[PDB]
Structure formats: structure tokens, C-alpha cells
């Protein structure tokens, strides 16, 4: 598809900080915080703009669930430039870098991960991106790393755990702003594989509702991913 | 052996040690750690079996990292001498892999075992 | 401030038209989509595979159900 | 297929796989290069039935009818305020297809090579008789 | 009096609440919505700023483990004068921990104080005059990385990247030293061209120019320490019958200085070799015990990381360095290479004939064994024991295979 | 100390500054004056390095490791001095050999 | 801390009285309050004292702000000087309450006095706070009538800057004043220019 010889046209996406590369093939794209290097081997689009040479990173949706949400057409993304953003289940910088891209230098990204091995690649990537604050800790006890986190306008959790909802529940109570953002990616197989997906996705919605989270939208991620979806809701403390 | 995880349990190991036996008979078994690594790289493995009693255990601890990278299920059995005997050899086998073949005559129970390992994981 | 008169609500409506027509050229024609989607789905099924996953749900579903 | 037979009768296990692994990687880069159109199912939650009945796609996103159909890039309406080319797209979508077709073809040839060489292997071969090897 | 223990990446903050049971009011959200209200409700009592990034880490780790630190204990001690006062603390564990200290304080940790902590943590950049949000963000950002290294057991003496640049540097340093060497050969060769054919070693060639400036010095100058007896007298004879022309002291001064560069380049090259040796015996001692240090550094470099080579199966480890013979051989129906980079290991050297092939397979297999213990072992002892026993097994194989 | 590489873009000054500031932990007001003597405080880097050295992500390297940095940095300094010497010799030599050209 | 709780209590009671809508307080006096800012060097005590007079601008208006002008002098030199947003809030709140109250009370002399107090510290004001604070003062005062006084006072500094060769400081004054004259409307801008020229004519007549 996209090749060094090919020329592409970059235009803005409906979401601030998300960009589209037209041409032969229509790419989901973000500005690079650290130009000249690819975090997970993603291809890079470099453009002349008045002339400064701005550099971009391709966002592969098959690799990042959030990007799969973009192409599926999420109505609202609380993740945007100039916002504090808290990320749970941070295996590596495959998606954090792109989230670090959209927030921009002004924003910050709080990355949380539990396993020692995936974390070491995350901290290596955090060195290139000053706006990422890496947290090697279990999300089941947000009290441990309350030390290191301010507020967060939006919490988006990719923890593939049966107890994912509570992990969101506790973190949102600790840090999330009132009327703040909540974006949950769900994989029904982990929490309950026995029952069909549709009943599973309904079940979690009530749990978020029980935790004063008002769900706004949800999106299943085929053809990229099976038995998955992203749920979007707002934190109504009152 | 804390790191060997998940470790198949006494009931489960039979269904594991059972399936490997026919796979050896039908030549669908790749045995020994180095062969297992081949199968993951080529992606011709249903799943991989490791022995927890190995000394020093780490030798197989590279295989899991390759496993979740490729989304291939894996499980540990308690005894290596048991595994090699099930493989059909005179030497203990620490790691073994089942070769992918949808046309095999033992096809059903392999995936039945695969599901159980997936639940175990 | 929501002080739009009739005139402003038409000029912007023209802009809504103007930009929307432009993006159609990038969005490409329908007939190629009819064939491109056929090529698209066939790539996806193999690379994702997932035939085993769909069946495995049935095997799990069948196994759990009581047999009378 | 005549191609597999000529490949099967004149090439070696060493050769076949090396091609098979090349295409597997080059397919992966190709598939990664390709992007698809959403088939994802998607639901809206609404507070009240009266709010539900008056719900319409135009209002929710603040967009137009041409754009509701476009889930990928449904810009807000406030934000708004090639036959050879489209053929080149299809070649890329098609150019990866020959890899996918080729890869199973090479996979088939490798499997036949492995089956024959296994037969040449020294064994009981009653179908192999259960016999522990020393 | 009600006190709140608030922990900040800059330091510990105590906040004395005007209401002793502020944690028992149900309108806390409304009362603490704005910066002005929270400043009125809470006024700073004591603040201990972390003097150094290190001190922050133990202080942070103490918070993680629920233990009261000395700085917190002293800072809490400053308020002990206030009899019958209430401590509001985020954590029950720290609440219970402060409780064993037995200070004259009723410690409270409940869900209601969550709202205070949310609100106090809301306007923290304002609540702490003198520190900006960016500075807090930077201090927050830094403390994470320091904590992150500690939890992941990161150690300065256990990073494989150093080898990769060192080996790349070592290959680099060999190149220029040669380029400067040939230049000193040509530049000094003009004065005395016959040196090069006699003495081939670059460092020895440079040292001669240091001891001797001009061929007239050749008659009396002694080159014993640089050269053996027979070679030193050859260069002496070549001096008088030299075909080259005399050069000025200005030319001598600079060409000498070049000779100084050669030897000091050489001196550091040995230092880097010793430095590389030390690194490998720390990151991969078992591998070094088996294959060696020069080869092992190349081993990790070809893969790019210890984990990658650790995940690389041993058969690959055999033939990582002869791919072009390989992929040429595989595509062309010819025998494949069987040593790769491992041909330069010591062990393969003692082997002979076809046995050299067999050792490579055995040694490559054992190389994976030593490495994976070098790579994936969480509490590895820097002894190389797994390599040493592996080395013994290979040697026994060769003794029988050779005999 | 990754931030420092950005502070002093001129490589030669960076090497000299590294030779002095061997460990970013060591930060004194007197040391601030000494590094302030290196180059000039007009750019303000002298205050930046103290502030940046206080808060930075640079992972500490072992004593042997930093020994390589300073000596290898010392190696770069010598070549720059030599290159200046050779340049003067070349300037003199052309005047003697080809004064006209 | 005795005074610290004392001032908070008064703010507590003033809020309660405001709820009951006490029209005016007869014997309340600000001289005690003003002395506190002078005597109490604690900024927080001073800031709370500023909160108090702000609430007290509503209650007993024109009867307890006869000597409110000193508070402006101290804030122009002290409160605005500190780069604390809370001190930015109190000076912001004081300007939007006390200054209108002074108008409700020879009304030009105090207005320009308010302008002199803050303008003398213009170069002292933080840049990010400079535009906003003076932007607040121009709006609360009648901009048509006050802008001319602004533009002349700024005219004096930059002129001294050129005489002082402070070109960098001189240029800064242009962007601030221009960015200040941004926020205004068209009618406001022209009136001040007319007022500035009138001041210039007054000077020319004097010579």
C-alpha cells in the first residue's frame, strides 16, 4: 500500500489530533511527538508544511483497539490535545505512543501495567516521549500509585481481566474528573466465554451504571477483532 | 517451580499426555524445545507442552514469551520423564509441540484439549 | 452568538455543500467499492482465520448443554 | 494443480519453505499496508423514550446525510463550515491476493514433501506400529 | 483539630482542617469545588520537600509499603503539640501504621475523606505556592521512572545495550586506526619508505617514529623494546641506504604527533576490549564461559538484544553469521553453511575435520542453554555455573569424538 | 543525562561539560559557577543543567561505564586540538610551497 | 492564627448577613480592616482581608469604603506583584466589586488614581497576568472615559524607554497596549485616541 515513492495528502480527522492520509489508500494517522523513529515498526509519513518538515506515524487498527474504534466511527472521544489521560493495561507503547500523540506536548499520559517483562519496553519508549508517565503497578490497587497521578479527564482501560470493571471503578473514583471520560474495551471471552457476546456486553453496562458511570456509546470492532467492543461513558458523580 | 504457570492438574495431564501419544503415532508431534521454537516461528503449532520439573527451568521459559506473541495456548505438565515417555522416546522430553493438520484423524480431541488449555489460561 | 440571519445560514449551507462534494472525490466511486469489498472480505477471512473459534464456541455450547 | 506438481516433482523441502516464509512476511506487510471498511455493530444509549423517538443520526453527531453513511470520517458539520487511480487501489487489494492464494499453494506443496519424507523415515509402518524408539 | 496527610511528589504536606469532623459532612463536594474554598478550609501545617531524587524513591517506596518514613515521622512530630487532634489519611494501612506510632492523634481513614483527597488533589498546584504544574508534572514524571526501575529490578550493570554500542564502537575503532596507520606509513614512508616492508605492525611502526625522528638517529637509537634483534638491525641498515629525502623539524613535529595518536588509539582499544570483557561477564557470564567474550558480543549484536537471541533457537544460533551462504545455498540446491559466526569460538578451534561440524551443533545447542539462563533468570548469580557445567559436557563430547 | 545533550548542541563544549559533570547527581552552587565559566551563562544553560540534572530520566551508568565516556570524550578533545595544529601546519606549508596559489 | 480565624469568622458572618439582606451597616469601619493589611505581613492574612472588603463592598456600600483607596495602592504594589493565581483571584474580585462601588459614590480623580497605582507597576506585573489585570480594570471603569488616561500613562513609559534606550522593553509596551486595545470595541478605541490627543493639546498649551 503506502510506500516511500507514493505521495499522500494529509487532512484532519473529525477528532482533534487525529489525521487522515489520502492518496491510494486512506490511512488513520497521528502526529509524532518524537520524529524520526517508529515505536513498533509502523510506517511514517513525512510532509512539508510552511517550510517545516512535519512527520507522522501510521496507526494500525489491527494492533490498537482504540484505532479500531476510530475507523468504526466513535461519536465522542474524550482523548484530545491538551488533556490528562490515564491508561490501564499498558502492555507496551504500541497504543500509548499514539495516545501520547493526540494529547500532544501539553497533555500527559499515565500508563499502568503489571507484568515486569512488558513494562521494560514501555519505560524505554517513555524515554522518547516526555509526556508519558509510566506506572509499573497493579491496577487492582490504585491506592498504591495515587502518589503519581493528578486528575484525569478520560480513563480508557484495555485490561483483559475478569475484574476489569471494578479496576475502572476504583481508578475512576480515585482520579477521574466529574463528568469525565470513560472508554472501555471489552473482550467477552476473558470475563465470560460461555455465554454469547451480546449478553456479555449488556452485563458490563449495568456494572458501569452501578458505579455512577453513564454509558453514552459502544462499538464492536469487527472486522479487526472478534467478540470485542469499546464502550464510551461519562462519569456522573452527582 | 512457582514460575511454571499455568500447570496442568492431575486430571488434565492425562488428556494432555493422552493426545500427545497418538500425535507421536501419527507423526504430528514435534518434540524437544528447539523443534517447538521452529513450530512457533512457522506458526504450525496448535499448542505447546512444557515440563515443570525441568532443571534449570528457564530453558523453556523463552517458549511462553513466543507463545502469547503468536496467541498460541500453552500449558505445563509436572514431569518431564512422563512427557518423553508419552512422546515415545527413551529420553526425557522437556517441551513438545503438536503440528497443525486439519485433515488429521485425531483432529477433534486436540482442539478439545486446546479449549481446556485456553480456559486454563 | 446565534445571530445568524437567513443569508448567513445559506452561505454556510453552501460551504457544507462545497466541502462535502470535495470529499466525495477522495471517497472514490461506488462501483469499485462493489468489487473492492469482495476482495476485502476474502483477504480478511484467511488472515483472521477464526473458523476454529466460531466452531469452538459451538463445541463449548454443545458440551455444556445437558443431553437427554 | 500443474504448478504444484512441477514444483513437487522438481524442487526440495529446503527451497519450498524459504519461499513460503518470504511470502508470509511480505503478505503481513501487505496486509498491514491495507486498510478495510468497518462492519462493526454499534449501539446508542438514550435516556428517555421521547428522546429515543426523536433521535436521528443527523442530530447526534452534528453531521449531514452524506456523512452519516461514512462512519470512518464523519466530521462535524461545524467543521465543514480517477478511474486509473481507483484501479491502482484495486491492484493493491488484489496484489496481496496472489500472496494469499500462493501461500496456501506453497503450504500444500510443503505438506506433501513432509508426508513423503516421513514415509521414507525408518519406522515400523504397519499407519505406524506403536514402537518406542531407542 | 483535624489534620490531613497529603502526599506530594515534591514532598509531604499536612493540612489542618478547621472542622474536626470535616470527614463527617455530606456536602463536601459542594464545599470543596473551588480553589478559594479549599484554601480557606485547609492551611498548610508542615511541608517536607524531598531533597534528592534518591530520597524521594525510598520515601515513595515507604508510602507504597504502608510504612511511616523518618521524614514523615519527624514532620508529624512537629504537630504533636496539638492535643486531641484528628489525622485524616488516605490509606487504612498508613492509617494503621501511623497508629502504632502512638502519637497523640485520632487517625481517620474512611470513604468520606476520598472527597477531600479528590478536592485537595484537584487544586494541588495552587495549594502549593512556589511550584508550577509543569514542575509538578516533571517531578511526578521523574519519580515514576526511578520507581519503575526499582520495581523492575533494573541495575546499571545489567543493560545489554552497552555491549551493542561497545562492539559497534570496537569495530569502528579498528577502522580509523588502520586509516591513520596507512597514512603514517605513506607520510613517513616519504622520508624512509623501507620501514613498511620490514615492520608490518602499525603500533610498532608508530613507536619507531617516536623513538627515532630521522634516519641519522637510526645508527645510535635502540629499538630493542619495540623490535627483536634481527628486525631492528634490518631497519638500521635500511636507514643509511634509504631512498627517501630529509624532512624539516616542522614536518617531524607533526608527523610525530600523528604517531602519538596511533599508540594512544591503540591503548584505548585495549581498554575497550577489557571493558567489553567486564560487561559480558556481568550480563551473560554463562555464555562467556562457553563461547567466549569476542564471539558472545557478536552473538548479541547480530540479534540486537539478549532476549531476541535468547528467543532465537540454537540451530539459528549456529548459522546466524553465514546467511548469505545459507539463503544462496537454500535457493540454489547446495549444501548449507554449518558454522556461521561460531567458527571463531575457541572450542570449534580444537576440533578438526568433520568433528568441527559436530561441535558447532553441540556447542550451539549448549550456547542456547547458557544464554537463556543469562537472559531470563530473575535471580541469576554472576558466576557462570550453568555455562561451566555446559562447557564440561561439550569437552567430554570432543574427547570421545576426537578419540 | 539525556536532557544535557539538548542543552549544549555544540559537541565540543558538550564533551568538555561532560568531563566536568561526570555524574548529574553532583550539583553544587560552586560547581554551578565552574560550569558557568565553561562557555557563558548568556544562553542560561548553567542554570538549566542544574535544574535539569535535579529532575531527569537519565539512567545511572556504572563507574566503569562513565570512565569510558570521559576517556572517550577526552579522545575527541585531543583530535580537535590536533586538527587545529595540522591546519596551522598546512597553512604554513602552502605559503612556502605555493605562495601565489 | 488568632487573627486568621478572626477574619474567617467575619467572612462567615458577612455571608450570613448577606443572605438576610441587611441593607447597610452603620457603625462598621474599614480603618481597622485597612490597618490589618499594613500591620499583618502574612500574604494569606492580607488576601483574606481583601476577600472581606470585597464582600463588604455590597454591605454598607459607600459608608465603609471612604478610605478604600489605600487597599488599591498596596495591591498594585504587593498583591499583583506575587505570581499567585489566588492573589490574581482576589485582585480580580476586588476590582469587580470595590471599583464599581467607588463609582456609585469629582469622580475622575479617584479613577485616575486607581490607574496610577497599577500602571506604575506595569513593568512589574507578570506578562501572562499583565494583559488580563489591566484588561479587567479598563472594563470595570468606563472604558470610553478611562482609556485615554491609560494610553497617555503608557505613552510616558515607552517614551522614557526610548530615552532610556530600552528598545526591548519599549517594543513590549506596544504589544501589551495593542493587545489591550484589542479587547476593546471600535467606539472605545476611537474615544481614547481622541482623549489622548486632548491630553497632548493640554500639554502643548501648558508649554
Taking the C-alpha atoms of residue F37 and residue F30, their distance in angstroms, rounded to an integer, is 11
C-alpha–C-alpha distance, residues G92 and G85, integer Å:
10
Given a contact cutoff of 8 angstroms between Cβ atoms, the answer to whether A109 and A103 are in contact is yes
The HSE-up count of residue A16 (CA atoms within 13 Å, CB side) is 9
- The shortest CB-CB distance from C60 to any of A26, A194, A223 is to A194
Nearest 10 degrees: Cα torsion C7, C13, C14, C16: 150
Contacts of D134 in chain B (CB under 8 A): 90
A233 and A168 in contact (C-beta within 8 Å)? no
SS3 label, residue E199: coil
Q: Do B34 and E369 touch (CB under 8 A)?
A: no
Choose the closest CB to C44 out of A26, A194, A223. A223
Cβ of C38 under 8 Å from any chain D Cβ? no
Q: Where are the alpha helices (DSSP H) in A49-129?
A: 65-72, 93-103, 116-128
E240 contacts: CB under 8 Å, gap ≥ 6: E215, E218, E219
Q: Distance (Å, rounded) from C-alpha F76 to C-alpha E208?
A: 25
Q: By CA distance, what is D77's nearest residue in C?
A: C16
CA distances from D101 to A1, D23, D27, D112, E25 (A): 18, 11, 11, 17, 71
User: Quick one: which of A113, A68, A44, A40 has its CA closest to A228?
Assistant: A68
Beta strands in chain A (DSSP E): 9-12, 19-22, 27-31, 44-49, 52-58, 84-88, 108-113, 132-136, 152-157, 176-187, 213-219, 228-235
Sign of CA dihedral E198, E203, E204, E205: positive
Residue A158's nearest CA partner among A228, A107, A208, A222 is A228
Q: Is A96 in CB contact (< 8 Å) with chain D?
A: no
* Resolution to one decimal, Å: 4.2
Torsion of the alpha carbons at G119, G125, G129 and G133, rounded to the nearest 10: -20
Q: What whole-number distance in Å separates Cα of residue E113 and Cα of residue E24?
A: 9
Residue D12 in contact with partner chain C when CB distance is under 8 A: no
Residue A163 in contact with residue A155, Cβ under 8 Å?
no
In angstroms, what separates the C-alpha of A175 from chain E's closest C-alpha? Answer: 7
Q: Give me the residue from B25, B42, B89 closest to D130, CB to CB.
A: B25
D128 and B42 within 8 Å at the Cβ level: the answer is no
The C-alpha cell of A210 is what? Answer: 452501578
Q: Is the Cβ of C25 closer than 8 Å to some Cβ of chain A? A: no
C-alpha cell at E182: 596507512
Nearest CA in chain D to B84: D132
Q: Collect all residues from D whose CB is shorter than 8 A from any CB in A.
A: 30, 32-36, 38-45, 60-61, 71-76, 79, 85, 88-89, 92
Chains A and D touch (3+ CB pairs under 8 A): yes
DSSP code at position B59: G
How many CB atoms within 10 Å of residue E212?
A: 22
**D51 vs E138: CA distance, rounded Å:** 46
State how beta strands B95-99 and B45-51 pair. antiparallel
Domains, chain B, ranges and CATH? 1-121 (3.30.1330.30)
Q: Nearest by CB to A134, which of E64, E90, E144?
A: E144
Beta strand E2-7 pairing with E11-17: antiparallel
Across the interface, which of E311, E315, E373 has its CB nearest the CB of B56? E373
Residues G24, G28, G31, G35, CA torsion sign: negative
Residue of chain E nearest A119, judged by CA positions: E152
Task: Answer whether B90 sits within 8 Å of D133, measured CB to CB.
Answer: yes
| Structural contact between residues E355 and E401, judged by C-beta atoms closer than 8 angstroms | yes
E141 CA to chain G: closest CA distance, Å? 24
Give dist(CA A169, CA A157) in Å, integer: 11
Q: What is the DSSP letter of E51?
A: S
The enclosing H or E element of E46 equals strand E42-49
Residue D91 CA to residue A6 CA, distance in Å, equals 15
DSSP E349-374: HH--TTHHHHHHHHHHHHHHHHHHHH
| Residue given cell 531527569 in the structure block | F56
Interface test with E, best of D11, D12, D14, D113 (most E CBs within 10 A): D14
Evaluate whether E153 touches E378 at the Cβ level (below 8 Å): yes
SS3 content of chain F, % helix, strand, coil (to 5): 70, 0, 30
* Residues A121/A52, Cβ–Cβ less than 8 Å: no
Q: CB under 8 Å to B49, separation ≥6 — which residues?
A: B16, B20, B74, B75, B76, B77, B83, B95, B96, B97
Under an 8 A CB cutoff, do B42 and D21 touch? yes
First to last CA, chain G: 57
Which residue's C-alpha cell is 473458523? C51
Residues 40-79 in F contacting A (C-alpha not used; CB under 8 Å): 57
The residue among E53, E48, E57, E49 whose CA lies nearest residue E75 is: E48
Q: How was this structure determined?
A: cryo-EM
3-state secondary structure chain D: CHHHHHHHHHCCHHHHHHHHHHHHHHHHHHHHHCCCCCCCCEEECCCCHHHHHCCCHHHHHCCCHHHHCCCCCCCCHHHHCCHHHHHHHHHHHHHHHHHHHHHHHHHHHHHHHHHHHHHHCCCCCCCCCCCCCC
Instruction: Say if D106 is an interface residue toward chain C (CB within 8 Å).
Output: no
Alpha carbons G50 and G65: distance in angstroms, whole number:
13
Quick one: DSSP state of residue G76?
Answer: I
The crossing angle, in degrees rounded to 10, of helices B107-120 and B10-25 is 150
Verify whether the Cβ–Cβ distance B27 to D128 is below 8 Å: yes
Amino acid at each position: 500500500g503506502a510506500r516511500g515513492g507514493a505521495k499522500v495528502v494529509i487532512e484532519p480527522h473529525r477528532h482533534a489530533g487525529v489525521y487522515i492520509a489520502r492518496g491510494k489508500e486512506d490511512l488513520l494517522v497521528t502526529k509524532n511527538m518524537a520524529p524520526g523513529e517508529s515505536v513498533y515498526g509502523e510506517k511514517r509519513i513525512s510532509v512539508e508544511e510552511p517550510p517545516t518538515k512535519v512527520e507522522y506515524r501510521v496507526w494500525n487498527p489491527f494492533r490498537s483497539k482504540l484505532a479500531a474504534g476510530i475507523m468504526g466511527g466513535l461519536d465522542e472521544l474524550f482523548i484530545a490535545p491538551g488533556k490528562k489521560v490515564l491508561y490501564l493495561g499498558a502492555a507496551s507503547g504500541t497504543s500509548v505512543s499514539h495516545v501520547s500523540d493526540v494529547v500532544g506536548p501539553e497533555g500527559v499520559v499515565y500508563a499502568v501495567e503489571f507484568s515486569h517483562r512488558p513494562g521494560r519496553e514501555l519505560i524505554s519508549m517513555a524515554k522518547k516521549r516526555p509526556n508519558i508517565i509510566p506506572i509499573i503497578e497493579d491496577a487492582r490497587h490504585p491506592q498504591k500509585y495515587r502518589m503519581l497521578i493528578g486528575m484525569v479527564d478520560c480513563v480508557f482501560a484495555d485490561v483483559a481481566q475478569p475484574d476489569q470493571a471494578r479496576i475502572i471503578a476504583l481508578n475512576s473514583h480515585m482520579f477521574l474528573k466529574d463528568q469525565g471520560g470513560v472508554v472501555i474495551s471489552i473482550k467477552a471471552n476473558c470475563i465470560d466465554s460461555t455465554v454469547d457476546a451480546e449478553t456479555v456486553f449488556a452485563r458490563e453496562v449495568q456494572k458501569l451504571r452501578e458505579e455512577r458511570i453513564k454509558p453514552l456509546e459502544q462499538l464492536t470492532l469487527e472486522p479487526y477483532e472478534r467478540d470485542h467492543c469499546i464502550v464510551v461513558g461519562r462519569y456522573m458523580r452527582s | 517451580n512457582p514460575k511454571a504457570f499455568p500447570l496442568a492438574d492431575a486430571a488434565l495431564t492425562q488428556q494432555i499426555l493422552d493426545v500427545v501419544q497418538q500425535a507421536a503415532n501419527l507423526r504430528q508431534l514435534k518434540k524437544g524445545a528447539n523443534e517447538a521454537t521452529k513450530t512457533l516461528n512457522r506458526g504450525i503449532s496448535e499448542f505447546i507442552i512444557m515440563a515443570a520439573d525441568c532443571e534449570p527451568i528457564e530453558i523453556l521459559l523463552h517458549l511462553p514469551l513466543l507463545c502469547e506473541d503468536k496467541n498460541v495456548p500453552y500449558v505445563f505438565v509436572p514431569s518431564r520423564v512422563a512427557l518423553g515417555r508419552a512422546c515415545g522416546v527413551s529420553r526425557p522430553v522437556i517441551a513438545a509441540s503438536i503440528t497443525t493438520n486439519d485433515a488429521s484423524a485425531i483432529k477433534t480431541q486436540i482442539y478439545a484439549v486446546k479449549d481446556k488449555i485456553e480456559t486454563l489460561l | 452568538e446565534g445571530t445568524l440571519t437567513d443569508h448567513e445560514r445559506k452561505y454556510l449551507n453552501k460551504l457544507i455543500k462545497r466541502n462535502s462534494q470535495n470529499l466525495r472525490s477522495w471517497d472514490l466511486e461506488e462501483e469499485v467499492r462493489d468489487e473492492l469489498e469482495d476482495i476485502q472480505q476474502s483477504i480478511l477471512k484467511d488472515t483472521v482465520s477464526t473458523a476454529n473459534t466460531d466452531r469452538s464456541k459451538r463445541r463449548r455450547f454443545k458440551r455444556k448443554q445437558f443431553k437427554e | 494443480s500443474m504448478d504444484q506438481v512441477k514444483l513437487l516433482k522438481t524442487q526440495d523441502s529446503n527451497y519450498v519453505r524459504t519461499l513460503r516464509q518470504i511470502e508470509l512476511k511480505k503478505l503481513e506487510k501487505g496486509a498491514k499496508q491495507l486498510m478495510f471498511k468497518s462492519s462493526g455493530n454499534h449501539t446508542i444509549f438514550v435516556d428517555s423514550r421521547e428522546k429515543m423517538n426523536e433521535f436521528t443520526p443527523e442530530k447526534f453527531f452534528n453531521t449531514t446525510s452524506e456523512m452519516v453513511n461514512r462512519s470512518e470520517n464523519r466530521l462535524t458539520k461545524d467543521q465543514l463550515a480517477k478511474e486509473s487511480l481507483d484501479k491502482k487501489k484495486l491492484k493493491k487489494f488484489k496484489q496481496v491476493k496472489q500472496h494469499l492464494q500462493r501461500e496456501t499453494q506453497l503450504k500444500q506443496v510443503q505438506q506433501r514433501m513432509d508426508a513423503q519424507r516421513e514415509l521414507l523415515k525408518k519406522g515400523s509402518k504397519k499407519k505406524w506400529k506403536k514402537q518406542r524408539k531407542r | 483539630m483535624a489534620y490531613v496527610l497529603t502526599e506530594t511528589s515534591a514532598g509531604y504536606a499536612l493540612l489542618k482542617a478547621s472542622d474536626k469532623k470535616i470527614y463527617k459532612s455530606s456536602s463536601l463536594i459542594q464545599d470543596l469545588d473551588s480553589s478559594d474554598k479549599v484554601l480557606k478550609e485547609f492551611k498548610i501545617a508542615a511541608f517536607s520537600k524531598f531533597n534528592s531524587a534518591a530520597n524521594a524513591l525510598e520515601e515513595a517506596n515507604s508510602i507504597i509499603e504502608g510504612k511511616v518514613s523518618s521524614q514523615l515521622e519527624k514532620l508529624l512530630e512537629e504537630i504533636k503539640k496539638d492535643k486531641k487532634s484528628t489525622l485524616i489519611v488516605s490509606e487504612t494501612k498508613l492509617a494503621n501504621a501511623i497508629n502504632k506510632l502512638g502519637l497523640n492523634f485520632n487517625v481517620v481513614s474512611d470513604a468520606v475523606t476520598l472527597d477531600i483527597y479528590r478536592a485537595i488533589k484537584e487544586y494541588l498546584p495552587e495549594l502549593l505556592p512556589g511550584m508550577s504544574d509543569n514542575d509538578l508534572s516533571k517531578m511526578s514524571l521523574g519519580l515514576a521512572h526511578s520507581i519503575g526501575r526499582h520495581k523492575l529490578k533494573f541495575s546499571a550493570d545489567k543493560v545489554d545495550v552497552m555491549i551493542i554500542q561497545a562492539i559497534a564502537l570496537l569495530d569502528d575503532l579498528d577502522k580509523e586506526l588502520n586509516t591513520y596507520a596507512m597514512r603514517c606509513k605513506e607520510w613517513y614512508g616519504w622520508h624512509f619508505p623501507e620501514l613498511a616492508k620490514i615492520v608490518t605492525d602499525s603500533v610498532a611502526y608508530a613507536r619507531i617514529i617516536l623513538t627515532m625522528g630521522i634516519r641519522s638517529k637510526a645508527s645510535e637509537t635502540d629499538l630493542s623494546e619495540i623490535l627483536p634483534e634481527e628486525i631492528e638491525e634490518r631497519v638500521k641498515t635500511a636507514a643509511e641506504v634509504s631512498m627517501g629525502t630529509e624532512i624539516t623539524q616542522t614536518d617531524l613535529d607533526n608527523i610525530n604527533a600523528l604517531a602519538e595518536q596511533i599508540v594512544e588509539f591503540a591503548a584505548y582499544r585495549e581498554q575497550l576490549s577489557n571493558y567489553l570483557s567486564a560487561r559480558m561477564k556481568a550480563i551473560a557470564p554463562n555464555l562467556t564461559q562457553l563461547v567466549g567474550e569476542l564471539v558472545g558480543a557478536r552473538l548479541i549484536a547480530h540479534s540486537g538484544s539478549l532476549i531476541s537471541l535468547a528467543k532465537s533457537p540454537a540451530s539459528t544460533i549456529q548459522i546466524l553469521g553465514a546467511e548469505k551462504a545459507l539463503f544462496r545455498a537454500l535457493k540454489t540446491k547446495h549444501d548449507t553453511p554449518k558454522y556461521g559466526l561460531l567458527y571463531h569460538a575457541s572450542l570449534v578451534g580444537q576440533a578438526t575435520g568433520k568433528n568441527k561440524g559436530k561441535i558447532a551443533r553441540v556447542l550451539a545447542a549448549k550456547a542456547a542453554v547458557s544464554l537463556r539462563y543469562d537472559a531470563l533468570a530473575e535471580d541469576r548469580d554472576d558466576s557462570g555455573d550453568i555455562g561451566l557445567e555446559s562447557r564440561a559436557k561439550v569437552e567430554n563430547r570432543l574427547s570421545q569424538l576426537e578419540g | 543525562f539525556p536532557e544535557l545533550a539538548k542543552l549544549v548542541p555544540d559537541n565540543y563544549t558538550f564533551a568538555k561539560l561532560v568531563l566536568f559533570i561526570k555524574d548529574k547527581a553532583s550539583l553544587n552552587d560552586d560547581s554551578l559557577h565552574d560550569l558557568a565559566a565553561l562557555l557563558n551563562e548568556d544562553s542560561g544553560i548553567a542554570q538549566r543543567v542544574i535544574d535539569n540534572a535535579r529532575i531527569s530520566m537519565g539512567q545511572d551508568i556504572s563507574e566503569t561505564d562513565m570512565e569510558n565516556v570521559c576517556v572517550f570524550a577526552q579522545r575527541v578533545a585531543s583530535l580537535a586540538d590536533y586538527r587545529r595544529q595540522l591546519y596551522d601546519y598546512l597553512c604554513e606549508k602552502m605559503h612556502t610551497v605555493a605562495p601565489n596559489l | 492564627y488568632a487573627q486568621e480565624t478572626l477574619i474567617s469568622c467575619t467572612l462567615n458572618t458577612i455571608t450570613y448577613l448577606k443572605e438576610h439582606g441587611c441593607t447597610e451597616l452603620t457603625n462598621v469601619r474599614a480603618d481597622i480592616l485597612v490597618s490589618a493589611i499594613r500591620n499583618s505581613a502574612s500574604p494569606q492574612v492580607q488576601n483574606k482581608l481583601l476577600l472581606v472588603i470585597g464582600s463588604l463592598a455590597t454591605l454598607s456600600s459607600e459608608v465603609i469604603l471612604h478610605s478604600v483607596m489605600p487597599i488599591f495602592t498596596f495591591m498594585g504594589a504587593h498583591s499583583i506583584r506575587q505570581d499567585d493565581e489566588f492573589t490574581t483571584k482576589v485582585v480580580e474580585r476586588t476590582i469587580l466589586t470595590v471599583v464599581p462601588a467607588l463609582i456609585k459614590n469629582n469622580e475622575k480623580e479617584e479613577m485616575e488614581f486607581l490607574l496610577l497605582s497599577f500602571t506604575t507597576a506595569l513593568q512589574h506585573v507578570p506578562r501572562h497576568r499583565r494583559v488580563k489585570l489591566f484588561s479587567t480594570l479598563i472594563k470595570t471603569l468606563d472604558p470610553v472615559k478611562a482609556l485615554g488616561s491609560f494610553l497617555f500613562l503608557i505613552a510616558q513609559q515607552y517614551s522614557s524607554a526610548l530615552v532610556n534606550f530600552k528598545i526591548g522593553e519599549a517594543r513590549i509596551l506596544i504589544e501589551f497596549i495593542k493587545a489591550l486595545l484589542v479587547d476593546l470595541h471600535v467606539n472605545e478605541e476611537l474615544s481614547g485616541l481622541n482623549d489622548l490627543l486632548d491630553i497632548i493639546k493640554l500639554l502643548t498649551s501648558s508649554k
